[PDB]
């Protein structure tokens, strides 16, 4: 589960219950993050077995996990994910 803590859609929740969950500015994204700071294809939330992973898929402004830039990271309960100006918290 992902809850938006910062952004125009603050308080919005998104369920992570698929192998791949796309997050970006593309209107067909599983998590549509509508802002100029978010690339059309920005990140993906990948589920393999019991672990949830965030993957940057070539965005301009990058993907941050707990205020650190990442290419890919294994997510853990309470982690903050930053996609453009959006700040999301990952919950179990």
């Amino acid at each position: 589960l992902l809850v938006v803590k910062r952004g125009p859609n603050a308080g919005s929740r998104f369920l992570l219950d698929q192998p791949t969950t796309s997050a970006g500015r593309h209107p067909d994204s599983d998590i549509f993050l509508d802002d100029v700071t978010v690339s059309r294809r920005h990140a993906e939330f990948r589920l393999e077995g019991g672990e949830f992973q965030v993957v940057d898929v070539g965005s301009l402004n990058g993907t941050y996990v707990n205020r650190e830039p990442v290419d890919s990271a294994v997510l853990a309960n309470g982690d903050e994910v930053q996609i453009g100006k959006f700040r999301l918290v990952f919950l179990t």
Binding site: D34, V36, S39, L60, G84, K85
Partner: protein, 822 residues
Amino acid sequence: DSIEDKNARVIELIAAYRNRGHLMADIDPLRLDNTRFLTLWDLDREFKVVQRKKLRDILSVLRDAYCRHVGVEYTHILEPEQQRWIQERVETKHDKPTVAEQKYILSKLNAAEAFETFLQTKYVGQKRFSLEGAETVIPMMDAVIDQCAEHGLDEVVIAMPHRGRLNVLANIVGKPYSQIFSEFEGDVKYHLGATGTYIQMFGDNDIEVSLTANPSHLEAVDPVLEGLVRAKQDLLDTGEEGSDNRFSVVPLMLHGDAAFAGQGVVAETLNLALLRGYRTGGTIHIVVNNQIGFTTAPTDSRSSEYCTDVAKMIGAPIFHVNGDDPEACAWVARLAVDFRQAFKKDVVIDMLCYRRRGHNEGDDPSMTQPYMYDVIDTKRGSRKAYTEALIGRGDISMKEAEDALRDYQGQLEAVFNEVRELEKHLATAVDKAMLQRIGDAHLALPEGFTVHPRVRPVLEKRREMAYEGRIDWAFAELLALGSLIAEGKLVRLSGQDTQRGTFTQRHAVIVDRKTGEEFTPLQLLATNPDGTPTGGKFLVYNSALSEFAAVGFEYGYSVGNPDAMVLWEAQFGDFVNGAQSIIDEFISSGEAKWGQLSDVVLLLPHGHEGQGPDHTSGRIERFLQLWAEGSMTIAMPSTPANYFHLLRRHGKDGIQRPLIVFTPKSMLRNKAAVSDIRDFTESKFRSVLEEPMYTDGEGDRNKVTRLLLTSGKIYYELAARKAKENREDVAIVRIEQLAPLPRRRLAETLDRYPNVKEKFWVQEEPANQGAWPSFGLTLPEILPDHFTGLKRISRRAMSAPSSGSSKVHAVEQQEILDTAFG
């Protein structure tokens, strides 16, 4: 030459770079002026600066600080601590922006260029508003707002002309494309106000970002922006009339190079920057300097090196920056905010750029500027140039450049997609205690206060009037303002010498004869008898000697705080023509054009008294000509109580509409022009007034065969002539509210005079002025059974408001009275 002679030249060289290095800086992205750009053995010699440095190292620091992409002007600043602050931040080795910061700037350049491409591709006639060649103003503005959010400020209020406005709306204010382009046809959207929330990309804060409405009149919005920001600061209890000195509402004023140098309102607005009644704690100015003004070259636009030289008027630091360097642009923007926060003073950013397209459609700018446009045709876009520079320096990889390109395509798709989806589908009366409390306030002087001997009788007369009557005009005004403050209203009153009053009648502020200390009697009404605050306040100021900037500011203030009572007073109504652009473009028309509401009051001293054509008229006829239903209230009250009710009605009606009042001069001291206590406690505003002999006396209306309709002070002279000749066959009816015409009240009043055989509109003004041009035409139309055959009695038509001779005035005045009773 010895070491002593060498030193003297080194210190002079250091001063030469600090003073004039900006003249050699690489600030022009077009490099149009080619001519723009101690011995060699002295380079390795050390010199005291309390450091020791080689001349080559001194030169290196000076050239990097003053001669690269930033031209700094600051040695004109008179405050040495301000010069030192700039010197310390400019004469240091700078830390290169991180890759994340560079990519963020690129993301903003991507959004700026994608928006311009959309605008120029989807619609016709957008070329004139194009930001192409000046796109770096978007990451610059973003850096200003982000730095304000970094200081934890509350709001940034923007004023700007058309160029890049829709770009700013989307990429700075954050308005959705579906709202910006909603029913898009230039468009009215280029003039409308907006509000949004800015979220820091790298920090913890948010800040409100707004944009004020404006006409096509370049720079006219500058003082409106200042007043609006001040009104918001006063509400947030920040700044000059606030408990904190953060000035947490920031004006961000955008300009063009030709307009900034040529429009006098720029100087008038800069002149307000440190005034107690007008300061906003410093404005951030951005000049989009594309080194052209339509077809006009800078040499025909200004008489100085820079378009920003007017800002030297108030010792503002000036930063000339190369628009092809978005990192230098963002850095200058952050430094400007830091300086504004440290010293609460204006900072000017001159962004040197170019205008890629012609000024209008079909316009080939090589017709008048062939050299500039042959150079522009070789320029690559700001985004492609910045992307290539990042690759060249190795700041980003080719894979990251491809990421940036895909981001740009996505920015383009986002706007085309959304627009594609959009195209598819109350009593004003007060009790006796209230009058007495305002009267008593005039004598509740601080302990040890020494009233001037000529002011003391005014204070005592006000207590006397409050309890016994014969209330004069000046006291009735303070009774209105004072009762509003006691009811919790903020009252802001200003104008030239408005604290004392031009005619020494107001005394809103009294000055201690021995110490110069000030006392404001109406401020005592901000506190209830029990000691609790009412929430009300009296903000009274003497303005600068301006009409355009001052009227603009008061309009702006009323827009920023709709709950405030805002009054601007002209010295004589004859000088309000200096603010004609604010009257025409904002006050009279802003509601119909932009849905922007204002409750601003204009007080215009008016009346024919033989003091000449510049001390006689507030041009009633011009304000009546501008009027249309629901735009303004226009009045000329004849009694102090009717003025009192007019102001209280205006302040309590819950309607935001400007009020124009033609106020008296000699009628201030006319002993017949006084009001009874009953008029304040048991009456209301009277749009139409009858003679007291009919309402309070034993006068017989049925004896009247000639009706004299009039407005203002000439009423008293007409009434005196009627009393003198004992003329019961003549009645005088006053129209107190000139607009909207009180049609119903006027018809009901005239029906009370059944034997009237002739009607005359009597006025002091020339036949082509005053209320006759509009009333002569409108009254027979809206009331044909009352006003068909209506004739005029006035001064002859004149090219000026009056004669320049007081003797001619007196002869003409007597002629009107003689004709009225002939």
